[PDB]
């Protein structure tokens, strides 16, 4: 019951019942902060590295690339260090010193990009080192990599089934890559065969999924719900297993995160506040009265600035 390295130590994260949200305790949270690296992305972080090894696109001598300096950047950084790979992360020069020092604390070869450029000054940059030796660099692409939802289908989803004794009725999750809701949803509906309700959450400000589903014009915008609302349909979001889409604004998300800390004693990130707020909305519909709703809390406070 000892792990060979920190990557193997992912998951078995806890389910806590909320007291000041939902109705007669129908809203239960999954705490994704309780992982190495301290985000939901630890899971994919391990398994995208495991997978590239297993199929042999990763080997002693290949060094990893991406431009995510978000939770997946930290995930990959921890796993790379645990497992002997050197990591390069692209990232505009516009970023925070503390993530620049979290990652340089993790042994990332950070590659400062352009504050005239953003995530193009990054995305396209990473590629160029992938280009300058495509037998050297290898880039994992969390937005389209199947090893992303696969891990969720084989860990996140089952842990929920088991913890709940197959009682779970609804699952609520914010969408970045889509891998959580996709893997979770496939586990419960396909491997177990229970016809639950899958709710994706997206910002009202950048509501590209609803817009797509309604055959409207896709119109992304800025928000503050860090970790979700990419502004496009990720290839890792299986639109097929998605029953419902709830939108949430930045203020409410932000306020719901403060409430979680101060009322529930739960150290929630901003995305976590988004997902709860939408679960609560469903939770207070007579239609989901007698229904056990599980919410993903992807990250922990302290990584944050919901503290104004």
């Amino acid at each position: 019951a000892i792990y060979a390295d920190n990557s193997y130590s992912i998951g078995n994260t806890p389910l806590v019942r909320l007291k000041h949200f939902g109705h007669n305790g129908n809203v239960v949270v999954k705490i994704e902060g309780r992982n190495p690296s301290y985000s939901v992305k630890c899971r994919i972080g391990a398994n995208m590295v495991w997978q590239a090894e297993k199929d042999g696109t990763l080997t002693k001598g290949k060094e990893i690339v991406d431009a995510t300096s978000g939770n997946t950047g930290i995930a990959l950084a921890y796993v790379a260090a645990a497992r002997g790979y050197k990591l390069t992360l692209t990232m505009p020069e516009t970023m925070s010193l503390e993530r620049k020092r979290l990652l340089c604390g993790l042994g990332v070869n950070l590659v400062l990009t352009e504050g005239a450029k953003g995530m193009k000054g990054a995305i396209a940059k990473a590629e160029e080192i992938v280009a300058s030796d495509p037998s050297r660099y290898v880039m994992l692409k969390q937005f389209e990599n199947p090893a992303n939802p696969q891990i969720h289908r084989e860990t996140t989803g089952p842990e929920i089934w088991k913890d709940t004794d197959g009682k779970v009725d609804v699952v609520v999750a914010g969408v970045g890559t889509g891998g959580s809701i996709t893997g979770i949803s496939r586990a419960i509906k396909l491997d177990f065969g229970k016809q639950i309700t899958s709710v994706a959450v997206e910002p009202v400000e950048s509501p590209v999924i609803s817009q797509t589903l309604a055959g409207e014009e896709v119109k992304p915008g800025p928000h503050k719900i860090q970790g979700i609302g990419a502004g496009f349909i990720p290839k890792n979001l299986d639109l097929s297993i998605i029953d419902r889409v709830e939108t949430v604004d930045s203020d409410t998300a932000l306020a719901t995160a403060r409430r979680l800390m101060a009322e529930e004693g739960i150290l929630a990130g901003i995305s976590s506040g988004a997902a709860v707020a939408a679960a609560d909305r469903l939770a207070k519909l007579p239609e989901f009265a007698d229904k056990l709703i599980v919410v993903i809390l992807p990250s922990a406070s302290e990584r944050y600035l919901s503290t104004a």
Binding site: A67, T68, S69, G70, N71, T72, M91, P92, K117, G118, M119, K120, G121, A122, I123, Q142, G176, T177, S206, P222, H223, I225, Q226, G227, I228, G229, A230, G231
Partner: peptide, 7 residues
């Protein structure tokens, strides 16, 4: 230069 793409 998509900010909310850095997940």
């Amino acid at each position: 230069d998509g900010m909310n793409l850095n997940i």
